[PDB]
Design a protein around this ligand. Structure first.
Ligand SMILES: NC(=O)c1ccc[n+]([C@@H]2O[C@H](COP(=O)([O-])OP(=O)(O)OC[C@H]3O[C@@H](n4cnc5c(N)ncnc54)[C@H](O)[C@@H]3O)[C@@H](O)[C@H]2O)c1
Ligand SMILES: NC(=O)c1ccc[n+]([C@@H]2O[C@H](COP(=O)([O-])OP(=O)(O)OC[C@H]3O[C@@H](n4cnc5c(N)ncnc54)[C@H](O)[C@@H]3O)[C@@H](O)[C@H]2O)c1
Ligand SMILES: O=C(O)[C@]1(O)C[C@H](CP(=O)(O)O)[C@@H](O)[C@H](O)C1
Ligand SMILES: O=C(O)[C@]1(O)C[C@H](CP(=O)(O)O)[C@@H](O)[C@H](O)C1
Ligand SMILES: [Cl-]
Ligand SMILES: [Zn+2]
Ligand SMILES: [Zn+2]
Lengths: 381, 380
């Protein structure tokens, strides 16, 4: 299995088949506990927990007293990133017989909705317990399972309450992608694309060249696209791990991972749950690249490559994309609404709105988000 | 200059009579620079103490550009506020400001431990964490709760089950707040002082026995004697926290009395206070160490008497407790059920702090005790 260090810990392990062959034993040996709590959603639990339940019994066969594996199946989708579902999980763990205690090892089996919600549960449970990430979506493998950011949403916006809590293990198993719906694979590509745009022209170029091939494999899995798939995923995870190790708590550099997200999160607060995170970030990347162009920092040629590359992977580049309009029931994303939502962006320095600006594909303007005047933002909205 | 105490490698603790009137505002402006200061307090305290500070704040921020804002939130007093709803209500109020409070916010916890625990916990998860400072206004908060970063809320099942370790940037201890503290609350805080001495200093325990009469006379109507008992408790906790911040062993000692105590408190709150429940928990956990042959009977008597000399309850049968909880009783089964939720437990193994003598723990961590042994000291 491939390993990636983050924050001085060898916590990322990647290999096809980890969930079938490695995770249970590795939990029993490196995350020794009497109590394991597996959190997942109802779309994937019945597909993927049966095998693990069996792997667990076998791995725990010579441990005495016998440890227990307890399972919580949450509703799928963004609506589960809420105060209520966080409380519900907590209440159920506390209600176990005996209750789940400080030795508990929590296992986030799912995409970024389950990872963000479960990692936040683990961060405050009795003041904190160990957890691991088992990313099952492309988005989670390339971005959300890595780095420790956890959160829930409130009615005002995205991820406003949460905590930075690092997982003890991050198991990346590409076999999960075999059952991942087409729209979700495409949704995840927005974060892959973003990560390349903030770090490498060559990696961005590889993504452009690979689009047709990958998309055909996705809509037809991946036997014939296996090496390119692995390389684009590893390039995203490794860059993210670099940035986080240098700036875990976002005093500067980690701002860069939020490219596309100042306008993207402002759109998402309105368009969720009908439109996905990556879809919202794609429109946010286009607008924020348009803003950099407006400010003279980014070349028009660069804005066109960003637009085309997102479109080549099937992502939306406009709030008026017809696939978006078929799903949103006439929702409005007016300029005033979007500005109000951007005042809740966590990167803001007091009332100064801070947005990531690119100076070229692969190169950020600054090693942090920049302050941008409200009037300039209003132009691209 | 005020007295400073180091904790976790920084001189975060600052103590002097009058700090709130003369030092805090300026110190926050220079050392916790921000555009937005959010003060959280309870309605008993706010109207007394915030007006002076509002003025001090404006004064201190006069040369600052742009001028910073001070926003205040007054919560209902008492344990009822350490809840999921009240945490969400403060968070919603912060996010609803114009403009919203952001990551630069400096939160000020002006109050006893209820306000400290709640406010600290809000700070720890707000936008994934903002700076905060503690301004302890009760004796309990000056000698124990404002120090060390443990924050939390309760749930209907028990005490402090959800929370976080989040250290304050400053801890300002101003004895002037004790001028208005109700007698019952002063006595409540003395349980944590007595506990702190019993787990680590027979000298301090002796000083508390010797000064009880004088301290209580003053409460019910010595400054150097009081200041010394407060400073001894705080320094002992700062050493423990600096050494074992996340409670891998040594910090368990600060929970002496609390395995049984928090089990009682889950039943008797909000009518009976934390210190009051911990006082009974100290007696029962001492009896338990006696039962296990670890603690001598004479030491148990000495603990009971010291608690009573300060006016704390030493049994569930205490007449005053019975008067405030008419209709509420603590069963052995309910206590045992509640102890299963204790955060020090290792899986199902209950862990309790055992003392081998006044001033000396059996070991420098909580010890596993069989369920059938714990049950024998739980009756009234
Ligand atoms: N913490 C971070 O650093 C971070 C980074 C990026 C995005 N995010 C968050 O990520 C969330 C989006 O995550 P997501 O896109 O993974 O959503 P998700 O977890 O809801 O998963 C997407 C969908 O796919 C289903 N699914 C998941 N794995 C599957 C599999 N292997 N086979 C079949 N179906 C499967 C799910 O049930 C769900 O319907 C947002 O809430 C966003 O804010 C967080
Ligand atoms: N985090 C920790 O390390 C820690 C340590 C010990 C106890 N605790 C927690 O502390 C809490 C108890 O705190 P507390 O006893 O300070 O309670 P509290 O904050 O409710 O204050 C006690 C009462 O005195 C009032 N008051 C406070 N200061 C006053 C003043 N100067 N003048 C007049 N009235 C004043 C308050 O309104 C309240 O009615 C419990 O919830 C307990 O679990 C936490
Ligand atoms: O710092 C990160 O890990 C992120 O910037 C974190 C954001 C969530 P945040 O803006 O709430 O921190 C995530 O959506 C993004 O893809 C990567
Ligand atoms: O470690 C501490 O600071 C304490 O043990 C923390 C407890 C609360 P906890 O048992 O919820 O950690 C507090 O009541 C006690 O007086 C001191
Ligand atoms: Cl919370
Ligand atoms: Zn994102
Ligand atoms: Zn206590």
């Amino acid at each position: 299995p491939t390993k990636i260090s983050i924050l001085g810990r060898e916590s990322i392990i990647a290999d096809f088949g980890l969930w079938r062959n490695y995770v249970a034993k590795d939990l029993i040996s490196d995350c020794s506990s009497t109590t394991y709590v597996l959190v997942t959603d109802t779309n994937i639990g019945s597909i993927y927990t049966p095998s693990f339940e069996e792997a667990f019994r076998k791995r725990a066969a010579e441990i005495t007293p016998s440890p227990r594996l307890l399972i919580y199946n949450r509703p799928p989708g963004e609506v589960s990133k809420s105060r209520q579902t966080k409380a519900d999980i907590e209440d159920w763990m506390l209600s176990q017989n005996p209750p789940c205690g400080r030795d508990t090892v929590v296992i986030a089996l799912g995409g970024g909705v389950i990872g963000d919600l479960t990692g936040f549960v683990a961060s405050t449970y009795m003041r904190g317990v160990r957890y691991v990430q088992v990313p099952t979506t492309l988005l989670a493998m390339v971005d959300s399972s890595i780095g420790g950011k956890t959160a829930i949403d409130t009615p005002l916006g995205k991820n406003l309450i949460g905590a930075i809590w690092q997982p003890t293990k991050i198991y990346i198993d590409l076999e999960f992608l075999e059952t991942l719906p087409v729209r979700e694979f495409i949704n995840g590509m927005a974060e892959v694309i973003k990560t390349a745009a903030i770090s490498s022209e060559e990696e961005f170029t590889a993504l452009e060249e690979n689009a047709e091939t990958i998309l055909k494999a996705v809509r037809r899995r991946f036997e014939g696209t296996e090496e390119i798939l692995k390389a684009r995923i590893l390039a995203s995870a490794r860059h993210k791990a670099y940035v986080v190790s240098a700036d875990e708590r976002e005093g500067g550099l980690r701002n860069l991972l939020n490219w596309g997200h100042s306008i993207g999160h402002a759109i998402e607060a309105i368009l969720t749950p009908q439109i996905l995170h990556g879809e919202c970030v794609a429109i946010g990347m286009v607008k924020e690249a348009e803003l950099a162009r407006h400010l003279g920092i980014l070349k028009g040629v660069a804005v066109s490559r960003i637009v085309k590359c997102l479109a080549a992977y099937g992502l939306p580049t406009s709030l008026k994309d017809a696939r978006i309009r078929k799903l949103t029931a006439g929702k409005h994303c007016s300029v005033d609404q979007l500005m109000f939502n951007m005042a809740l962006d966590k990167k803001n320095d007091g009332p100064k709105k801070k947005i990531v600006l690119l100076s070229a594909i692969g190169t950020p303007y600054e090693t942090r988000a920049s302050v941008v005047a409200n009037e300039d933002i209003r132009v691209v909205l």
